[PDB]
């Protein structure tokens, strides 16, 4: 949140403060707020529109401050922790699917408009399954792909 | 006729010569690049919008 203000003359209200020869600083591109309209806003001063100018020297510098070098890209984590992590996720997925069975097979005939009102408690199947699908697949295929890259790049 | 047919020639009190067996060489890590293709395709099915 940022704002820039320019003081206007409080002696001249009958005339126009800015003629607005175009539609740049207006309801265009921004709207005046409510709390600014209480303590002042278009009274005693006004607001101006901010844009950010970015030079190429800093433009091609700002977009690259998150990456790492090549040791991060080609690194298998460990296989013992990976096996234990997959074991833990499959182990909780067992009980989660066991709950999912009862959740599907109950499905009390009364329109979700209230089945979303008895879901607002602690109930959780059908929603944690696909998250576990994502964290299993996107952590297994990446590790297998990196294992292949490591085993045939170096030789 | 059977002494001149093929390997394992016979006639001098025992049938000898032209033994036949196998060595079985293997590497088995050759389709690893192929495996890469497979796993990338998996991500392909996971990532194009239905």
Curated annotation (Swiss-Prot), chain A:
Disulfide bonds: none annotated. GO terms for cellular component: cytosol; cytosolic proteasome complex; extracellular region; ficolin-1-rich granule lumen; nucleoplasm; nucleus; proteasome accessory complex; proteasome complex. Its EC number is 3.4.19.-. GO terms for biological process: double-strand break repair via homologous recombination; double-strand break repair via nonhomologous end joining; proteasome-mediated ubiquitin-dependent protein catabolic process; protein deubiquitination; protein K63-linked deubiquitination; regulation of proteasomal protein catabolic process; response to ethanol; ubiquitin-dependent protein catabolic process. The modification Phosphothreonine is found at residue 111. Component of the 19S proteasome regulatory particle complex. The 26S proteasome consists of a 20S core particle (CP) and two 19S regulatory subunits (RP). The regulatory particle is made of a lid composed of 9 subunits including PSMD4, a base containing 6 ATPases and few additional components. Within the complex, PSMD4 interacts with subunit PSMD7 through their respective MPN domain. Interacts with TXNL1. Belongs to the peptidase M67A family. PSMD14 subfamily. This is 26S proteasome non-ATPase regulatory subunit 14.
UniProtKB/Swiss-Prot annotation, chain B:
It comes from the Eukaryota. Belongs to the proteasome subunit S14 family. Component of the 26S proteasome, a multiprotein complex involved in the ATP-dependent degradation of ubiquitinated proteins. This complex plays a key role in the maintenance of protein homeostasis by removing misfolded or damaged proteins, which could impair cellular functions, and by removing proteins whose functions are no longer required. Therefore, the proteasome participates in numerous cellular processes, including cell cycle progression, apoptosis, or DNA damage repair. Component of the 19S proteasome regulatory particle complex. The 26S proteasome consists of a 20S core particle (CP) and two 19S regulatory subunits (RP). The regulatory particle is made of a lid composed of 9 subunits including PSMD8, a base containing 6 ATPases and few additional components. Interacts with DDI2. Interacts with TASOR. This is 26S proteasome non-ATPase regulatory subunit 8. It comes from Homo sapiens.
């Amino acid at each position: 949140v940022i704002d820039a203000f320019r003081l206007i003359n409080a002696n001249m209200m009958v005339l126009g403060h800015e003629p607005r020869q175009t539609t740049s600083n207006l309801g265009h591109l921004n709207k005046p707020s409510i709390q600014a309209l209480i303590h002042g806003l278009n009274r005693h001063y006004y607001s101006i529109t901010i844009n950010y100018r970015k030079n190429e020297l800093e433009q091609k510098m700002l977009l690259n401050l998150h990456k790492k070098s090549w040791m991060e890209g080609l690194t298998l984590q460990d296989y013992s922790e990976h096996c234990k992590h997959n074991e833990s996720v499959v182990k909780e997925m067992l009980e989660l699917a066991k709950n999912y069975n009862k959740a599907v097979e109950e499905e009390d005939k009364m329109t979700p408009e209230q089945l979303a009102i008895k879901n607002v408690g602690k109930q959780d199947p059908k929603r944690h399954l696909e998250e576990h699908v994502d964290v299993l697949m996107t952590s297994n295929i990446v590790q297998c792909l990196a294992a292949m890259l490591d085993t045939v790049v170096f030789k | 006729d059977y002494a001149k047919k093929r390997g394992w020639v016979l006639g001098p009190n025992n049938y000898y010569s032209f033994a036949s067996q196998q060595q079985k060489p293997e590497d088995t890590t050759i389709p690893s690049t192929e495996l890469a293709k497979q796993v990338i395709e998996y991500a392909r099915q996971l990532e194009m919008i239905v």
